[PDB]
Design a protein around this nucleic acid. Sequence first.
RNA 1: GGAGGUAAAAAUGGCCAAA
RNA 2: UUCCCGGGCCUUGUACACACCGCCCGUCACGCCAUGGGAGCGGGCUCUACCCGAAGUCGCCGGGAGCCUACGGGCAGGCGCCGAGGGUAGGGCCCGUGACUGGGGCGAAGUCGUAACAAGGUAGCUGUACCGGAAGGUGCGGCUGGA
RNA 3: AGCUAGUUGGUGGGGUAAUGGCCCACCAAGGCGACGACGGGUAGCCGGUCUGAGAGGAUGGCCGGCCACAGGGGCACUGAGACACGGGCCCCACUCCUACGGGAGGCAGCAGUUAGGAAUCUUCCGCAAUGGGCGCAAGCCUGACGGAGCGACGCCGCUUGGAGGAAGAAGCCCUUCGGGGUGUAAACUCCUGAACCCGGGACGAAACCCCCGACGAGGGGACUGACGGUACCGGGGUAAUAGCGCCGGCCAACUCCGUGCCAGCAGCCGCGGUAAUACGGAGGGCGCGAGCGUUACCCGGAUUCACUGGGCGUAAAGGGCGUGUAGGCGGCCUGGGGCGUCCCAUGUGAAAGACCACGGCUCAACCGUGGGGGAGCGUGGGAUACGCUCAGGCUAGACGGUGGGAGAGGGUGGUGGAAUUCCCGGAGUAGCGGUGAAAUGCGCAGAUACCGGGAGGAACGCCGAUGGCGAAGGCAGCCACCUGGUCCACCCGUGACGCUGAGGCGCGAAAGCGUGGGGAGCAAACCGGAUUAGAUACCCGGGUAGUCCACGCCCUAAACGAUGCGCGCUAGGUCUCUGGGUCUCCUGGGGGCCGAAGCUAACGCGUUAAGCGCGCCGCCUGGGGAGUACGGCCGCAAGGC
Lengths: 125, 138
Amino acid sequence: PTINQLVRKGREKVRKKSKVPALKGAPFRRGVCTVVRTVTPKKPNSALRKVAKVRLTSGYEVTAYIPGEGHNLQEHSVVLIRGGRVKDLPGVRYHIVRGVYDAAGVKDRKKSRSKYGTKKPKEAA
Amino acid sequence: MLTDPIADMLTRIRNATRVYKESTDVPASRFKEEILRILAREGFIKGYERVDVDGKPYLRVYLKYGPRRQGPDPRPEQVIHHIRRISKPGRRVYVGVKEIPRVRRGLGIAILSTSKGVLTDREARKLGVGGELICEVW
RNA sequence: GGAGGUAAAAAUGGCCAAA
RNA sequence: UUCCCGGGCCUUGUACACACCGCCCGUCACGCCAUGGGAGCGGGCUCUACCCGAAGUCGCCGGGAGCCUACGGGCAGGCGCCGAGGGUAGGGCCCGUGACUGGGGCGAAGUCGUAACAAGGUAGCUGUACCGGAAGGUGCGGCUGGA
RNA sequence: AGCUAGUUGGUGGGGUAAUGGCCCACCAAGGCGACGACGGGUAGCCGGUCUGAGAGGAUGGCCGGCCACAGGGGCACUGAGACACGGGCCCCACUCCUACGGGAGGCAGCAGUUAGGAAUCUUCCGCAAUGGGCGCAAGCCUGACGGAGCGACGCCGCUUGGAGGAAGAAGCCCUUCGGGGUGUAAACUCCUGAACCCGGGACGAAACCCCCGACGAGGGGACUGACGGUACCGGGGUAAUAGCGCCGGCCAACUCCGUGCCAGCAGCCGCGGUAAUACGGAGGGCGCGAGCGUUACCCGGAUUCACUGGGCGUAAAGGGCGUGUAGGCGGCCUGGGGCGUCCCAUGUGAAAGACCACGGCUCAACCGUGGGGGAGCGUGGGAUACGCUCAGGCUAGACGGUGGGAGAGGGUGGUGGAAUUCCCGGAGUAGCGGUGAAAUGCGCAGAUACCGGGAGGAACGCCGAUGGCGAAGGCAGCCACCUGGUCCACCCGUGACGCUGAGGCGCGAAAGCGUGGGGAGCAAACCGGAUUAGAUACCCGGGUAGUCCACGCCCUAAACGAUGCGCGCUAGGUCUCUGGGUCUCCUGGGGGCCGAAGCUAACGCGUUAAGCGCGCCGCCUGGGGAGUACGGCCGCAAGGC
Ligand SMILES: NC[C@@H]1O[C@H](O[C@H]2[C@@H](O)[C@H](O[C@@H]3[C@@H](O)[C@H](N)C[C@H](N)[C@H]3O[C@H]3O[C@H](CO)[C@@H](O)[C@H](O)[C@H]3N)O[C@@H]2CO)[C@H](N)[C@@H](O)[C@@H]1O
Ligand SMILES: [Mg+2]
Ligand SMILES: [Mg+2]
Ligand SMILES: [Mg+2]
Ligand SMILES: [Mg+2]
Ligand SMILES: [Mg+2]
Ligand SMILES: [Mg+2]
Ligand SMILES: [Mg+2]
Ligand SMILES: [Mg+2]
Ligand SMILES: [Mg+2]
Ligand SMILES: [Mg+2]
Ligand SMILES: [Mg+2]
Ligand SMILES: [Mg+2]
Ligand SMILES: [Mg+2]
Ligand SMILES: [Mg+2]
Ligand SMILES: [Mg+2]
Ligand SMILES: [Mg+2]
Ligand SMILES: [Mg+2]
Ligand SMILES: [Mg+2]
Ligand SMILES: [Mg+2]
Ligand SMILES: [Mg+2]
Ligand SMILES: [Mg+2]
Ligand SMILES: [Mg+2]
Ligand SMILES: [Mg+2]
Ligand SMILES: [Mg+2]
Ligand SMILES: [Mg+2]
Ligand SMILES: [Mg+2]
Ligand SMILES: [Mg+2]
Ligand SMILES: [Mg+2]
Ligand SMILES: [Mg+2]
Ligand SMILES: [Mg+2]
Ligand SMILES: [Mg+2]
Ligand SMILES: [Mg+2]
Ligand SMILES: [Mg+2]
Ligand SMILES: [Mg+2]
Ligand SMILES: [Mg+2]
Ligand SMILES: [Mg+2]
Ligand SMILES: [Mg+2]
Ligand SMILES: [Mg+2]
Ligand SMILES: [Mg+2]
Ligand SMILES: [Mg+2]
Ligand SMILES: [Mg+2]
Ligand SMILES: [Mg+2]
Ligand SMILES: [Mg+2]
Ligand SMILES: [Mg+2]
Ligand SMILES: [Mg+2]
Ligand SMILES: [Mg+2]
Ligand SMILES: [Mg+2]
Ligand SMILES: [Mg+2]
Ligand SMILES: [Mg+2]
Ligand SMILES: [Mg+2]
Ligand SMILES: [Mg+2]
Ligand SMILES: [Mg+2]
Ligand SMILES: [Mg+2]
Ligand SMILES: [Mg+2]
Ligand SMILES: [Mg+2]
Ligand SMILES: [Mg+2]
Ligand SMILES: [Mg+2]
Ligand SMILES: [Mg+2]
Ligand SMILES: [Mg+2]
Ligand SMILES: [Mg+2]
Ligand SMILES: [Mg+2]
Ligand SMILES: [Mg+2]
Ligand SMILES: [Mg+2]
Ligand SMILES: [Mg+2]
Ligand SMILES: [Mg+2]
Ligand SMILES: [Mg+2]
Ligand SMILES: [Mg+2]
Ligand SMILES: [Mg+2]
Ligand SMILES: [Mg+2]
Ligand SMILES: [Mg+2]
Ligand SMILES: [Mg+2]
Ligand SMILES: [Mg+2]
Ligand SMILES: [Mg+2]
Ligand SMILES: [Mg+2]
Ligand SMILES: [Mg+2]
Ligand SMILES: [Mg+2]
Ligand SMILES: [Mg+2]
Ligand SMILES: [Mg+2]
C-alpha cells in the first residue's frame, strides 16, 4: 500500500484467540464428571481412549482425557481440568490431572511420576 | 508530468549504467545541478554540462565505469552500484545531525539537502546542519 | 490451399501400512 | 494391421505417484459437536412520558398560634421548585432458553449411482434460468484454465 | 452514520474563594459529525515492568505521582480545607438488640472468620529508630512505621564432604559367553568439618532534656532498643537430605524384556496390528539440581499487518468500465515571509527504576554515593537548500485554433437480397425424415423432390483478416440524419489550467422480471422414440416460456490480458492497420510475434513489461465453515452489495 493509505487505514493487529476457553486463561479448573466412557480415535489410529464429560465450576461442560493405565473415575467424581488437547480425539481439548481430589495416581508407575501423579515408592533401597 | 524530477534523474542514470552508455540527457534545474555536482566531486561520474536539446535546457551526465573484466560476462564493474531516492514526495524524510545514517561504514555517501546547501553525510556532519535526506549512494 | 475439423459402445476396485 | 491381447521409440494430456485393479463427487443411513430460524418464554442494561416523592440547599410566609439577651431582628414552624427512590405504560440493545426445523463440521473399512482428473468416454469451467434421488442434465451468453 | 433542550450563542441575574448554561428569566437558531460525532463493549492513567538488534509489541502487580470510591444511592452542616473510610441526615438490602414503641452496625485500615476459587499469610512484638497529631515542656496517641511469624512464590548465597583406592569385590544390565557396563562408583584408610554444645556480645542512639553561655551561636553532662542475648567473635564438636524431567527427528542421551492398531504415547511430523532405540518396566545414558516438570498468559522467533521491513498474470489479492467530489501528490526561473525543516542557548522532562563507575552488608541478591545524555514541550536568537505561502515571469506538461485522415463507436428513420417456415396454384408419384443402426414422426385425405405467386419473423453470405472501433459491456447487408471518441501536419493562442480519485453518479453480455406488441427458425421446461441394469442425459421426432421491438427494472460473469490509471528512462529484428514528409527512406499513433540488459519460484514478461522509478486508488494475510448466517441498504420477484 501507499504511505497515504497507511495513514488512512493502517495495519491490523493479529489478536489471536485462545485454543482453551478456561475463563480468562485460568491454568486449572475444578469440575465433576457426568459420564465416563471410551471413544474411538481418528483414521491413522485405533483404540479405546478413556475420556469423561466434565461439568466444571463455570457452567461449561466439555469432555476431558484420562491419561495413564487404569483409573477410579465415576459418574460423581470431582476432578481437575489441566488443558491441552488430544490429537486423535475430536472435541477433546482438555486433560484431567491425576492425583487430585477424586482422581488417583497410576498404580505401579515408576518412570514419569510428576505426570500421572504417582508417589515415590520405597523398597529399602 | 514528472511527479518526482529528482528521483527520475537517479533512475535515468541507473538505467544507463546497466546499458553502459557514455552520457544521458536529464532535465535542467538548479537543484539537479547541485546533486550532479556532488556526484562529480565524489567521483561517481565524470561530470556534467549545460546542453541544448531542441531548444530546451538539458544536462548531459557523463557516466563512469570500472575496468573491463575478464572471463564470462566481461562487462565492467559499476562505480555506481545503486542509487535511489530516500525522501520521497509521499513520505518526506528529515534528519538532524545525530540521526544521520552511516552508508556502508563510510564507504558510500548520502546526499542530503540542508540550509547551507546540498551537502554529503560527511560534510553535513562536520558543519553540523543536516536536513532532508535526499538519497544514499552505494 | 487456409480455416471450417471425427467418437456408437461399457459401471465399479473395502481400511491402514516400508529411511 | 482397421479391430481384440501384450510390447518398443517419439510426442501430447493429467487433479494419477503402494502409480487407472489410480483418483474422485454428491445424496442417503448411523453417532458427536457447534450454529441459524422458531409459537414464544425468562433475565440484564438503557431511554421516553406521567404519578407518588424522604433527607437536604435555595426561595416565599412567619400570620387568627408559639420561644428569644437589644424587636424594621433571630429561631421554631408552614408553603414551593429541585430531588434519592418507588410506581404505571411504551420502546432500544444484549444474553439465556424453547416443541420443531435448516444447512454445516467431524467420526478405518454401511447404501446408491459416475459427475470431475487421460476428447474421463457428451471438452471442462462459468453467470443466469428451468428440471431431476444424487452427483448432475439442458437452454442462452461468455472463458482457455481444451483441440 | 447521523447527533443535539440548557441543546449552541447573547443580555440580565443567583451561586462560588474564582471563570464558566454551573443554575434561572428573556432573546436569537444555533452547536457536533467520515479529521469518525452519537451509541455499544472493555479498561483507572503515568514514571515504569517484560520482550525485542532496533523500530515496535504486550502490560500497569511491589514502589513513587495523579484520579476515583468507603455497604448501594442522594444530600447538606462545621470548617482554611470535606459533600468527609473509623463525622451527620434520609431511602433501600442485610445483621443484631427490643419491655414490640423504637434502638445500634458498616474491615476497599491491621490481624482474623466465612463464602467463591486452581490459589494467596500472624486474631505476633514495640513506639527503640523515621515520620505524623497535640502540647512551650514533661509527655500522650500512632496496626504509618520499624520488626518478628507462615509459604522454595521469586532472586541470591550455602550444605549433603575432601584426598587416596582394583586390569577393577557383591548385586543388577547386556553378550557373539571369551567378556563388556554401572565404576573410583562402593567398602576401606586419613584429613576437614554444616549441624549442634559453651562463653562473650552489638551497629542501628542522637537529639528532645539538664548546666555554662542572654532558655540564641558555641561547649559540656545525663536517659532511652522491639528486633534480642538475634547478627557477629572465640572455644569444642558429628561424615552428615537428593530429587525431577528426558533419551525417534526437531533435541543431548541406547540396549534388554513384556504388550501386539490392545494397553498406551503425542508440542509438530507422527509411533503401537509378534523381534517397537517413539507404549510399560529394567539397566545405562543426557540435562538441571532443592529443585525439576506440567498447565495458563505476554514478547520473540513471525520480514506471518512488512515505518525500519511484504505482496496482488497463474500461489490469497486489480475494483466489470468510465465520469468525477473530498483528500493525497505535482514542471522551469526570480524575489518576500520563515509554517514545516535544521542549528544554538535557556527552562522543564520529580524521585525511584535502567546504564557506567566507586563503595556497605565476609560474597551475591539487596542497598548507598557520584556521572551521562534522552525523546517530547515552552521561550529567545540564527540559517533558507528542500517542502509551504505570497508576488512576478516561462515554456517542454495540459487544453485550445487552422487544415486534413481512418474506423462494425452510439442513437433515429428508411431500404435490399439469399435462406427457413406456412398458405395458394400447377405438375407428379409409394415413400419421405432421421441414425452408429433404428424407431417414434410425416405420407395414397396427393406427403418428400420441382416450378410459380403470396405472407411473416429473425440474421446479414462473399468482402472478412492473424483486420478495425469503443472506457468496459460490446459493435458487421445498404442509404440518410443526429452524435461521441481518436490520429496527423502547421507550430498559431491560453498558460501549471496537471495526475489519481474514498464517496457519489452514469454505463454495464447473457439469463431473469413488469406492461404492451411480435413470433419464421431455434429452443430451457414438458411429451414421445431409441440407448442402458437403470436415462429424469448424451442421439432422434414434436414443443412452451424465451430468443425479436418499445418503455421500465434486475447489476451478475472465466465482465480475462485472471495484468488499476498517469508520467519519465532502458538494444533491436520482423508482419500488419492508419496519417505526414525533401513519399528509396524517415517520422507519429495502433494491433501481433521473436528477442539486449534486466525481472521472475518457474512457466514466462520484455518501449502494447510482469524491467528500472514516482504519484494516487483498489485488494491479500493458511484451508474448510462461506460469499453462508445475522443486521443494514437496494429489488416486483429471482436475488444483489
Ligand atoms: N465437508 C464434508 C462433507 O462430507 C460429505 O460426505 C459425508 C458423507 O457423504 C460421507 O459418508 C461416507 C460415504 O461417502 C462413503 N460412500 C461411505 C463411508 N463409510 C462414509 O463415511 C462416513 O460415515 C462413516 C460411518 O458410516 C464414518 O465412520 C466416516 O467417518 C464418515 N466419513 O462422509 C462425509 C462426512 O464424514 C460430502 N463429501 C461433502 O458434503 C463434504 O465433503
Ligand atoms: Mg473452560
Ligand atoms: Mg496407527
Ligand atoms: Mg513418557
Ligand atoms: Mg457401488
Ligand atoms: Mg482403493
Ligand atoms: Mg491403521
Ligand atoms: Mg527401437
Ligand atoms: Mg475406474
Ligand atoms: Mg494411489
Ligand atoms: Mg436460538
Ligand atoms: Mg430592626
Ligand atoms: Mg424513576
Ligand atoms: Mg430468543
Ligand atoms: Mg439443529
Ligand atoms: Mg459432464
Ligand atoms: Mg465420467
Ligand atoms: Mg461418461
Ligand atoms: Mg453431446
Ligand atoms: Mg465429460
Ligand atoms: Mg449452465
Ligand atoms: Mg432435461
Ligand atoms: Mg467478452
Ligand atoms: Mg433556562
Ligand atoms: Mg473496571
Ligand atoms: Mg524482531
Ligand atoms: Mg464490603
Ligand atoms: Mg463554611
Ligand atoms: Mg473522615
Ligand atoms: Mg472501617
Ligand atoms: Mg482485614
Ligand atoms: Mg472453596
Ligand atoms: Mg515513634
Ligand atoms: Mg517522634
Ligand atoms: Mg510493617
Ligand atoms: Mg561387579
Ligand atoms: Mg571421593
Ligand atoms: Mg545504638
Ligand atoms: Mg540547648
Ligand atoms: Mg566454629
Ligand atoms: Mg528436558
Ligand atoms: Mg541425538
Ligand atoms: Mg519385543
Ligand atoms: Mg519420546
Ligand atoms: Mg521406553
Ligand atoms: Mg508466540
Ligand atoms: Mg512482527
Ligand atoms: Mg512497506
Ligand atoms: Mg507475502
Ligand atoms: Mg485457482
Ligand atoms: Mg488467484
Ligand atoms: Mg481490470
Ligand atoms: Mg483535487
Ligand atoms: Mg514544486
Ligand atoms: Mg520556521
Ligand atoms: Mg528520574
Ligand atoms: Mg563490596
Ligand atoms: Mg401443393
Ligand atoms: Mg406415390
Ligand atoms: Mg416454392
Ligand atoms: Mg506558439
Ligand atoms: Mg505562478
Ligand atoms: Mg479519472
Ligand atoms: Mg444488463
Ligand atoms: Mg437480455
Ligand atoms: Mg433477454
Ligand atoms: Mg418465471
Ligand atoms: Mg419479456
Ligand atoms: Mg424443433
Ligand atoms: Mg450401462
Ligand atoms: Mg430436441
Ligand atoms: Mg480473455
Ligand atoms: Mg471478457
Ligand atoms: Mg476479479
Ligand atoms: Mg508500435
Ligand atoms: Mg537473459
Ligand atoms: Mg517475448
Ligand atoms: Mg484505480
Ligand atoms: Mg452470488
